[PDB]
Design a protein around this ligand. Structure first.
Ligand SMILES: COc1ccc(Br)cc1S(=O)(=O)Nc1cc2c(C)noc2cc1C
Ligand code: NA
Length: 127
């Protein structure tokens, strides 16, 4: 099999803006997760060829990863924080759907998600 094209990170036609919440999502939330020991499987799109996962994109039709999120935040791709939060949720959910409870990778996703939710509790109010 082949890999699909990765998710877009800019789109002229998609409404986009900067908000202080989205700034916080990049500067604090993404940065804290990116540097965590458990970040490595989630720092780029799943490469189903190199990782030998020929069923991955048979099961997962809405892929998402932190590399894509980082680029989207750097490009001010989002209209609001909720759109960015939804991308993180998709990334975690995909891991839980494709794998099994207790799997090494699921336990890592669960730890990152816990940290994510802690950091998102301190999301400042919007301007
Ligand atoms: C067998 O490959 C493993 C085993 C344990 C861990 Br933790 C990670 C891998 S892997 O080489 O990153 N392959 C892999 C990646 C993902 C991603 C991303 N989402 O679900 C996955 C499942 C596997 C096996
Ligand atoms: Na599952």
């Amino acid at each position: 099999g082949s890999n699909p094209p990765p998710p877009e990170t800019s789109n002229p036609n998609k409404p986009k803006r900067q908000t202080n919440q989205l700034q916080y999502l990049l500067r604090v939330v993404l940065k804290t997760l990116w540097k965590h020991q458990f970040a490595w499987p989630f720092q780029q799109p799943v490469d189903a060829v190199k990782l030998n996962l020929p069923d991955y994109y048979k099961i997962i039709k809405t892929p998402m990863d932190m590399g894509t999120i980082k680029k989207r935040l750097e490009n001010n791709y989002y209209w609001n924080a909720q759109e960015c939060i939804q991308d993180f949720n998709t990334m975690f959910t995909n891991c839980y759907i494709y794998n099994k409870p207790g799997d090494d990778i699921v336990l890592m996703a669960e730890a990152l998600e816990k940290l994510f939710l802690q950091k998102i509790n301190e999301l400042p109010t919007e301007e």
